[PDB]
Amino acid sequence: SQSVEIPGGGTEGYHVLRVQENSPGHRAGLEPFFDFIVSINGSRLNKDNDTLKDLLKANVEKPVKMLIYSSKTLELRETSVTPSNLWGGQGLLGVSIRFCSFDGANENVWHVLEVESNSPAALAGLRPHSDYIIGADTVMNESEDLFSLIETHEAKPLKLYVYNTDTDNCREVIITPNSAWGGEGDLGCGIGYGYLHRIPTRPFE
Ligand SMILES: [K+]
């Protein structure tokens, strides 16, 4: 429970799924997958409503303070964002968000271990040790969920989003499970899960 305390309480906020290039969101340093918008100018975003939308519009072209919780670092931070209509893309922030809880979010990751040569994993470009699977086309909330998807994608392309500790960013991976492949399992990579196999929490010193 030794979790950073959230000003205004609770564990819900706005999960950043996507950040458009050169958006106000990108300039403020929002990272997809890991960041939850917790508050804006001190107003706690603990309800799925229009307060964020409305406070951005009110402050168009002006800077605004945001509190952000990261499921990567497990820390809160404050950042400045300037909502804008003048950058070419869609939205004042340029982000897609889903209102949900960040509680336990840092547990939902599957660490890529060794990757056997020429396996479905290698063909997809999964990288040993440095890659962590963190999402898919559907939500993945339980240890089993990655494997449920693998099992139902026998001989089918399965999209995964993967974080890499060398690049410190996430990328789309297409893998095709193949139980006939003639090395171990369906993937031909080991997968680590749980306390010792979460994202390293200090990408920067
Ligand atoms: K096999």
Curated annotation (Swiss-Prot):
Modifications after synthesis and translation: Myristoylated. Myristoylation is essential for the Golgi targeting. Palmitoylated.
Keywords for the protein's UniProt record, in alphabetical order: Differentiation, Endoplasmic reticulum, Golgi apparatus, Lipoprotein, Membrane, Methylation, Myristate, Palmitate, Phosphoprotein, Repeat, Spermatogenesis
One of the GO biological process terms: response to endoplasmic reticulum stress
Record localization: Golgi apparatus membrane; Endoplasmic reticulum membrane; Golgi apparatus
Residue span, PDZ GRASP-type domain: 12-102, 108-196
Family membership: Belongs to the GORASP family.
Annotated protein name in UniProt: Golgi reassembly-stacking protein 2
Species annotation: Homo sapiens (Human)
Gene: GORASP2
